[PDB]
């Protein structure tokens, strides 16, 4: 019953469906099919690996549960520099951020808006759509690799819908439920709480253990492009959506503003909605939108000059 040839290609089958599934439940926060329908391919799947172990591979869904424990981290060089922001505090500090923008560039631009995530940063490298590398931003030119345990965060694409090399970067975070969760099973256990979701994630990306890490319901948003490869992407905004287009995460609050007034909108807007949304942010994030823009403007040691982080106080 169930010949090595036959389980080999039904393995295919099965990861092709299971991870489309997967993508709409963890990356678009829409499932299509109910959980059942997942579970019963899922399960085939397994039989499948069990029997014939040499089938398993690195996209296959079954491997998010993790297994591997290491000894401790290498060194992740960023030979594209992940930059920190500049802050501002205050309605003031914005629309000065917009002054010099304007007095640099000569005409009034667009700003692309993003919430700010309360999460650890990193970075996620392609290879002709394979995931290789995961890293952490750690002092902005070396972080730690981190891969293995990205390889437990659910909406982590393995393969991406095209087979093109990239390295793209964003937010690692842990929704505030699984954090109030967490901090539960913690104080059943008698440890120390973590104090806050980005501490809980950040401890959660340092385990060395793989299998504890794919229990912490650690997710993501993508936005930035470090490497773009093959990508078309001229704007901030449309980086946003070639990301998702690809496969990845993003955060479907982004707005692309056409003046500093409705920039300043946009973070009053959110200053409010803030308590209902299912995850913490330190603030609003705004950027030049586009890239041509972007470089004319430059960077100074620490941060790009054509972007500001508003954070809340
Ligand atoms: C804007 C940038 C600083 C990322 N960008 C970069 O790090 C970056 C780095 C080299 C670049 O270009 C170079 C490429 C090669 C050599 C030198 C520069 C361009 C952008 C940033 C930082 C933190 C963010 C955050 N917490 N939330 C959101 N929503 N956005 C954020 N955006
Ligand atoms: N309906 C879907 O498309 C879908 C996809 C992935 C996981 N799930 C559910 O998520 C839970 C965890 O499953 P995984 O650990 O395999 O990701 C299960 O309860 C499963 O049914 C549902």
Redesign the pocket.
Same mark, same amino acid.
Request: proline share 5%.
């Given at each position: 019953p169930l010949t090595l040839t036959a389980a080999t290609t039904r393995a295919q089958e099965l990861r092709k469906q299971?991870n489309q599934? /997967?993508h %709409? $439940? $963890?990356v678009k926060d829409q &499932? /299509? *099919? %109910?959980? @059942? *329908? $997942?579970?019963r391919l @899922?399960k085939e799947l397994v039989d499948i690996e069990t029997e014939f172990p040499d089938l398993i591979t690195p996209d296959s &869904?079954?491997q +998010? *549960?993790g297994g591997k424990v290491l000894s401790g981290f290498e060194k992740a060089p960023h030979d594209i520099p992940m930059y920190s922001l500049n802050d501002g505090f205050s309605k003031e500090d914005i629309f000065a951020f917009d002054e010099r923008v304007r007095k640099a560039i000569g005409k009034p631009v667009a700003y692309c808006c993003e919430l700010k995530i309360d999460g650890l940063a990193i970075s996620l490298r392609y290879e002709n759509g394979v995931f290789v590398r995961g890293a952490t931003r750690g002092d902005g030119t070396v972080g730690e690799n981190i891969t293995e345990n990205l390889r437990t965060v +659910?909406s982590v694409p393995m393969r991406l819908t095209e087979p093109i090399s990239v390295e793209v970067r964003g937010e690692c975070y842990m929704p505030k439920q699984s954090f109030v969760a967490l901090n539960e099973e913690r104080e059943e256990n008698g440890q120390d709480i973590f104090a806050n979701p980005r501490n809980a994630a950040a401890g959660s990306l340092r385990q060395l253990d793989t299998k504890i890490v794919?229990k912490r319901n650690l997710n993501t948003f993508l936005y930035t492009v470090a490497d773009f490869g093959p990508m078309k992407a001229k704007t901030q905004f449309e980086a946003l959506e070639e990301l998702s287009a690809i496969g990845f995460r993003t955060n479907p609050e982004r707005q692309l503003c056409q003046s500093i007034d409705e920039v300043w909108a946009y973070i009053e807007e959110y200053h409010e909605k803030r308590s209902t949304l299912p995850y913490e942010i330190d603030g609003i994030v705004i950027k030049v939108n586009e890239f041509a823009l972007q470089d004319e403007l430059g960077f100074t040691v620490k941060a790009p000059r054509w972007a500001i982080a508003y954070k809340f106080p």
């Amino acid at each position: 019953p169930l010949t090595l040839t036959a389980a080999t290609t039904r393995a295919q089958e099965l990861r092709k469906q299971l991870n489309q599934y /997967s993508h %709409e $439940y $963890y990356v678009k926060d829409q &499932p /299509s *099919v %109910e959980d @059942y *329908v $997942y579970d019963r391919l @899922y399960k085939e799947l397994v039989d499948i690996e069990t029997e014939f172990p040499d089938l398993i591979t690195p996209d296959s &869904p079954t491997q +998010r *549960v993790g297994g591997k424990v290491l000894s401790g981290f290498e060194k992740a060089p960023h030979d594209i520099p992940m930059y920190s922001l500049n802050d501002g505090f205050s309605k003031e500090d914005i629309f000065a951020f917009d002054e010099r923008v304007r007095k640099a560039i000569g005409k009034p631009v667009a700003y692309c808006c993003e919430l700010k995530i309360d999460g650890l940063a990193i970075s996620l490298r392609y290879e002709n759509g394979v995931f290789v590398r995961g890293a952490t931003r750690g002092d902005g030119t070396v972080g730690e690799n981190i891969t293995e345990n990205l390889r437990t965060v +659910r909406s982590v694409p393995m393969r991406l819908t095209e087979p093109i090399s990239v390295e793209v970067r964003g937010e690692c975070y842990m929704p505030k439920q699984s954090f109030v969760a967490l901090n539960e099973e913690r104080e059943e256990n008698g440890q120390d709480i973590f104090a806050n979701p980005r501490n809980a994630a950040a401890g959660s990306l340092r385990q060395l253990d793989t299998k504890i890490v794919a229990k912490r319901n650690l997710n993501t948003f993508l936005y930035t492009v470090a490497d773009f490869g093959p990508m078309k992407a001229k704007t901030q905004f449309e980086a946003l959506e070639e990301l998702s287009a690809i496969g990845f995460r993003t955060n479907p609050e982004r707005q692309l503003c056409q003046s500093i007034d409705e920039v300043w909108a946009y973070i009053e807007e959110y200053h409010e909605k803030r308590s209902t949304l299912p995850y913490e942010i330190d603030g609003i994030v705004i950027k030049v939108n586009e890239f041509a823009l972007q470089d004319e403007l430059g960077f100074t040691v620490k941060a790009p000059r054509w972007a500001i982080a508003y954070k809340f106080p």
